[PDB]
Amino acid sequence: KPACIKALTRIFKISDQDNDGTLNDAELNFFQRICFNTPLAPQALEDVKNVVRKHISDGVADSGLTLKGFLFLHTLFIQHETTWTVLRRFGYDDDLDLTPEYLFPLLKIPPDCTTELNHHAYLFLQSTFDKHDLDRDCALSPDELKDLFKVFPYIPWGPDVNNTVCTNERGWITYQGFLSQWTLTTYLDVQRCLEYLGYLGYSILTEQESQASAVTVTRDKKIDLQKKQTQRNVFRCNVIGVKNCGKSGVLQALLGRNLMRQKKIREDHKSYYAINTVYVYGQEKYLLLHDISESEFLTEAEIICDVVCLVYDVSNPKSFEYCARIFKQHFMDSRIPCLIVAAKSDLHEVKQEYSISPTDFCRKHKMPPPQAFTCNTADAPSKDIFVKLTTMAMYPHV
Ligand SMILES: Nc1nc2c(ncn2[C@@H]2O[C@H](COP(=O)(O)OP(=O)(O)CP(=O)(O)O)[C@@H](O)[C@H]2O)c(=O)[nH]1
Ligand SMILES: [Cl-]
Ligand SMILES: [Mg+2]
Ligand SMILES: [Mg+2]
């Protein structure tokens, strides 16, 4: 029984689309249709409300069904089969748990293909954000996130999510940052995104066969390279360099954060990812950065990307050798574009101990010139390199 109440309470929360605490006639009729194929007459609906009002006082607020009122009607129909109709319609099984078919619809992704949310999927998330942004500040406070996750069986996002997407003045995920996190999750872990969409009741509220009906599968990367044109909107860039060469500073710069703001980031909440929108020649795209920590190996995983960002420290004389090394053993004869970034360029430039200068190296292997970059500036860092990286990802040849 307590398991039954738990499910119905969630089903209520999902059905309350405007998230006001009641099921108005608009939302109530929607619920009846998806469950019982036919809604009730406008005043025959008012008759049911009367039955509620004449038993409990807190069962009907405004002229819409409250949760207590909703749970009350569940008891009335028993003292059956009406409830199980509702439960099964919302993905629950006999054990009152969400079925694998509902939460994990199989979506086999072809090799060298990526996953994006379609336009209607984004719209669903845009409304989803608005429903829980009750303070209208275009950001989700910790309370507004707890509210959003009350349809989730566990907390899906950790405190590092705030160091991955755009946040506001107080570290709260903004409206744009919110969509960036979903864009990010969909790209890296589509099965997790589909699971999360199930918790939000996407498949039901949008009346579609599965959560998978929100994901777009882009074509083979090889075809994009051969046809020299892509339709993708999300591009992944791997950031590679020695330890403490300023990689994390590059990632956080994409989020618009100064170096001084970065020093207040606790390591418990550290993130090796950063995602944001970038405009390339009037086209809006998503740039996805992945901080690759200096390890003994570089597998076939940390090399798959649309563009590589080799970062070295100008105050570190031995740092650029790493860039030259990694480039020569993974990206020298690769169809992946590479951009060298001279990070910490606010510091005094020290002569690199490598055999050849960064400048000449970029000519020997036909790359763009080493880009000067710093996150240690007043206001927010420059988005120049991020436009560059995205541009090279979109047009590898040009
Ligand atoms: N002056 C200055 N210092 C910087 C800049 N970027 C980073 N730093 C400093 O350099 C150090 C290393 O930066 P960080 O971004 O953490 O490097 P990292 O390569 O991510 C470290 P790891 O390899 O372990 O991930 C920090 O002390 C940071 O404050 C910059 O543009 N200017
Ligand atoms: Cl559900
Ligand atoms: Mg409502
Ligand atoms: Mg808010």
Numbering used by the authors: 182 to 260, 264 to 582
Can you list sentences taken from the study reporting this PDB entry?
Human Miro1 and Miro2 (hMiro1, hMiro2, also called RhoT1 and RhoT2) are MOM protein homologs that play a critical role in mitochondrial trafficking38394041424344. Both associate with Parkin upon mitochondrial depolarization and are ubiquitinated on multiple lysines18374546. Here, we demonstrate that the cGTPase domain is necessary and sufficient for efficient ubiquitination of either hMiro1 or hMiro2 by p-S65 Parkin. We also find that despite considerable similarities between these two substrates, Parkin modifies hMiro1 much more robustly than hMiro2.
We determined the crystal structure of hMiro1 amino acids (aa) 177–592 (hMiro1-BC), encompassing the central EF hand region and cGTPase domain, to 2.5 Å resolution. Similarly, structures of hMiro1-BC bound to either GDP or the non-hydrolyzable GTP analog GMPPCP were virtually superimposable, with GTPase Switch 1 positioned far from the nucleotide-binding pocket in both cases. Thus, the structure of hMiro1-BC is highly evolutionarily conserved and, in isolation, appears to be conformationally inert with respect to ion or nucleotide binding. We tested whether different ion or nucleotide conditions might influence Miro ubiquitination efficiency by p-S65 Parkin. Using ion or nucleotide exchange protocols similar to those used to obtain crystal structures of hMiro1 constructs in different divalent cation and nucleotide states, we were unable to detect a change in hMiro1 or hMiro2 ubiquitination. This result suggests that neither the divalent cations Mg2+ and Ca2+ nor the nucleotide ligands GDP and GTP directly regulate Parkin-mediated Miro ubiquitination.
